[PDB]
């Protein structure tokens, strides 16, 4: 849902993040999250606070940065949020929007993104990611292509 947030919503979330981030180091700790929760009448344990962070902790460093905070504010988990971002990346290559990346689409978009590969490199990239062997890369294959 983080992709559906408006500009004013994001600007308000920036103000909120700054109030959570007491020491201004750009990350929210369990200590900082706990302060906020208790100001709102809750008493989460340290384990419950760490779990709130883990649910959005895409990089696994144990703290919330602002992109992860946007996941939290959209009331989403990190797995759904990452799937939204992978699907956005997929759509960049799927120029004709049919749900499959062709060799010509991969060559075209990679070229315009500054990496001009030979026709042989593109065919090789397609074949390696093409699991079901239909000659194209669907979304589920695109995810494994990126791991
Ligand atoms: Ca901090
Ligand atoms: Ca993190
Ligand atoms: Ca396509
Ligand atoms: Ca395929
Ligand atoms: Mg969304
Ligand atoms: Mg966006
Ligand atoms: Zn995200």
Residue numbers in the entry: 1 to 147
Can you provide the manuscript's text about this entry?
Herein, we describe the development of a photocatalytic method for the rapid and efficient dimerization and site-specific functionalization of peptide and protein diselenides. This methodology, dubbed the photocatalytic diselenide contraction, involves irradiation at 450 nm in the presence of an iridium photocatalyst and a phosphine and results in rapid and clean conversion of diselenides to reductively stable selenoethers. The utility of the photocatalytic diselenide contraction transformation is highlighted through the dimerization of selenopeptides, and by the generation of two families of protein conjugates via the site-selective modification of calmodulin containing the 21st amino acid selenocysteine, and the C-terminal modification of a ubiquitin diselenide. The unique reactivity of the selenol side chain of Sec, namely its low pKa and high oxidation potential and nucleophilicity relative to Cys, has led to significant interest in leveraging the amino acid for a number of applications in protein science.
To probe the limits of this PDC dimerization methodology, we next subjected a recombinant calmodulin (CaM) protein diselenide dimer, bearing a Lys-148 to Sec mutation [CaM (K148U)], to the PDC conditions. This selenoprotein was expressed using a Sec-incorporating amber-suppression platform in the evolved Sec-dependent E. coli β_UU3-T7 strain and employing an engineered tRNASec, based on recent reports by Ellington and co-workers. Motivated by these results on peptidic systems, we turned our attention to the late-stage functionalization of the recombinant CaM (K148U) diselenide dimer protein 12. To this end, 12 was first mixed with super-stoichiometric amounts of a synthetic hexaethylene glycol diselenide ([Se-PEG6]2; 16). This led to exclusive formation of the CaM-PEG6 asymmetric diselenide 17 after mixing as judged by HPLC-MS analysis. Addition of PTA (66 equiv.) and 10 mol% [Ir(dF(CF3)ppy)2(dtbpy)]PF6 (5) and LED irradiation at 450 nm led to clean contraction to the desired PEG6-functionalized CaM (K148U) 18 in 5 min (91% conversion). The PEG6-CaM (K148U) selenoether conjugate 18 generated from a multi-milligram PDC reaction was submitted directly (without purification) to a crystallization screen. A crystal diffracted to 1.95 Å resolution by X-ray crystallography, with the refined structure of 18 nearly identical to ligand-bound conformations of CaM published in the protein databank, thus confirming the retention of higher order secondary and tertiary structural features. Importantly, this highlights the biocompatibility of the PDC conditions.
